[PDB]
Amino acid sequence: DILRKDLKLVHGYPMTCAFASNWEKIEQFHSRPDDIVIATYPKSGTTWVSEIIDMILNDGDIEKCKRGFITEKVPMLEMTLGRTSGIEQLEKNPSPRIVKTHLPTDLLPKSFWENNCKMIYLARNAKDVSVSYYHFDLMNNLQPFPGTWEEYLEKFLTGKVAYGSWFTHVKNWWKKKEEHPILFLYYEDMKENPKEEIKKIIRFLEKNLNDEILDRIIHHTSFEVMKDNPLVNYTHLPTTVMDHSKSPFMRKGTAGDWKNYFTVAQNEKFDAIYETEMSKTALQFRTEI
Ligand SMILES: Nc1ncnc2c1ncn2[C@@H]1O[C@H](COP(=O)(O)O)[C@@H](OP(=O)(O)O)[C@H]1O
Ligand SMILES: Oc1ccc(/C=C/c2cc(O)cc(O)c2)cc1
């Protein structure tokens, strides 16, 4: 029915088959002014930063952060599956709501701009993203079968994956920085110095948290702890939807993991495409820490 189906176009972007229907519901979504959007290209650290922000908004209270599974606390806007949809769950949530999305800026519901909602756009280097997303498709049965790693990389590089080109996603979101309240963050900076990155989020949300709380947030949101937290590690989803025996959702949590899968030849070809796409932009991603 929806499982292992081909991607469908939605306003020019390839999309997970299940999510591509009744798209008008997404377009008409009603945001609230104090909604906080977490936006990322797939596999860029959405779940990671979702749990960070939840801790922040709950003043570092761990028991509060345990009130529900991640899909209820921080729903994915565009998700639909008979699981309650992301929008239905968002309609049930108290303000300030945290909203996760992978949508290109052009597909984000216009209400979010009209309400001046704050947004955190997190970006991750395209090499680790390709590898994370490949493995994700092995386990996430809503996605097309990715094929071999070599076939998948070619599709990733041409933007023939759900949510389209990493290049376009990152560059278009970056253009929206000057005109809207958006915090731009990088997965590699968060891995390298979570204290300083988390501090950037706390100031952006106009919050005031002491250093004891800050350390507890850092500890509670580290890969080692989150991987074994059943409220955030996606083991709560039906086996039919995500089969973690093919790849766990909390897979490696490393910057540089891409090196383990890219051949030198693949690397040189990637780099050439990357240069063509990205040389004119003032973004400098790190591929290792
Ligand atoms: N606490 C944490 N620290 C670092 N990376 C984390 C994390 N929690 C999740 N991730 C990583 O974020 C990626 C998934 O992102 P998203 O939530 O946007 O789908 C995965 O990368 P890997 O597949 O490289 O391990 C996942 O392991
Ligand atoms: O109940 C569910 C809750 C969430 C999900 C997430 C799906 C998903 C789909 C994508 O194309 C990209 C992605 O990064 C995640 C699926 C089922």
C-alpha to C-alpha distance for 249 and 42, rounded to whole angstroms: 12
The CATH number of the domain covering residues in 1-289: 3.40.50.300
Instruction: Report which secondary-structure segment, H or E, holds 185.
Output: strand 182-186
Does the C-beta of 81 come closer than 6 Å to ligand 2? yes
Q: How far apart are CA 139 and CA 240, in angstroms?
A: 10
Distance between start and end Cα atoms, the chain:
42
Which residue out of 102, 135, 169, 220 is catalytically annotated?
A: 102
Both tokens assigned to 12: 């020019």
Where are the chain's structural domains?
1-289
Residue 110's alpha-carbon distances to 177, 181, 286, in angstroms, are 16, 15, 32
The CA distance from 234 to 143, in Å, is 16
Element (H, E) at 201: helix 194-204
Residue 58 buriedness (CB in 10 A; 0-12 / 13-18 / 19+): middle
Q: Which residue shows structure tokens 């039906």? A: 238
DSSP3 helix / strand / coil % (the chain, rounded to 5) = 45, 10, 45
Q: With helix as H, strand as E and coil as C, how does 220-266 read? A: HCCHHHHCCCCCCCCCCCCCCCECCCCCCCCCCCCCCHHHHCCCHHH
CA 225 to ligand 1: nearest atom: 1
Residue 206: DSSP 8-state:
T
Task: Give the gyration radius of the chain's Cα atoms.
Answer: 18
Residue 44 in contact with residue 123, Cβ under 8 Å? Answer: yes
Beta bridge partners of 119: 37, 182
Tell how far the Cα of 47 is from the centroid of ligand 1, in angstroms.
7
Q: Is 28 exposed, middle or buried (0-12, 13-18, 19+ CB in 10 A)?
A: exposed
- Method for structure elucidation: X-ray
For 129, residues 6+ apart whose C-beta sits below 8 A from its C-beta are 41, 42, 43, 44, 166
DSSP 14-71: EE-GGGGSSTHHHHT----TT-EEEEESTTSSHHHHHHHHHHHHTTT-HHHHTSS-HH
Verify whether ligand 2 is closer than 6 Å to residue 38 (CB atom).
no
| Cis, bond preceding 96 (omega within 30 deg of 0) | yes
**Resolution of the experimentally solved model in angstroms:** 2.0
Do the beta carbons of residue 98 and residue 31 sit within 8 Å? no
Q: Which atom of ligand 1 is nearest to the CA of 257?
A: 24
Ligand 2 close to Cβ of residue 7 (< 6 A) = no
Tokens of 97: 């709501």
For the beta carbon of residue 244, count every other beta carbon within 10 angstroms: 15
Helix (H) or strand (E) holding 182, with range, is strand 182-186
Closest CA to 192 of 213, 167, 172, 218: 218
Look up tokens 């990205």; give the residue.
Answer: 278
Choose among 231, 233, 236, 197: nearest CA to 217: 197
Q: Which atom of ligand 1 is nearest to the CA of 128?
A: 24
For a mutational test of ligand 1's pocket, the pick from 44, 48, 76, 79, i.e. the residue with the most ligand atoms closer than 8 A to its C-beta, is 48
Q: Are strands 36-40 and 98-101 parallel, antiparallel or unpaired?
A: parallel
CA 26, 28, 34, 40 dihedral sign is positive
Please confirm, yes or no, whether 102 is among the known catalytic residues.
Answer: yes
Q: Which amino acid is at 124?
A: R
- φ, ψ of residue 23 to 5 degrees: the values are -70, -25
Q: Which of 140, 166, 237, 243 maximizes ligand 2 atoms within 8 Å of its Cβ, making it the mutation to test the pocket?
A: 140
* Token representation of residue 143: 């996605």
**121: part of which helix (H) or strand (E)?**
strand 118-123
Element at 13 (helix H, strand E): strand 13-15
Contact predicate 45/189, CB 8 Å: no
Element (H, E) at 269: helix 264-278
Whole-angstrom distance, CA of residue 22 vs CA of residue 36 = 24
Under a CB-based contact definition with an 8 Å cutoff, are residues 74 and 100 in contact? yes
**Residue among 77, 95, 166, 98 nearest 128 (CA):** 166
**Long-range contacts made by residues 217-225, C-beta under 8 angstroms, separation at least 24?**
217/52, 217/55, 217/56, 217/60, 218/194, 220/51, 220/55, 220/62, 220/65, 221/48, 221/51, 221/52, 221/55, 221/194, 222/194, 223/48, 223/250, 223/253, 223/254
Token match 């906080």: residue? 36
Under 8 Å between Cβ of 230 and 236: yes
Number of H helices, E strands in the chain: 14, 6
State residue 146 phi and psi, 5-degree precision. Answer: -75, -20
Indicate if ligand 2 lies below 6 Å from the C-beta of 89.
no
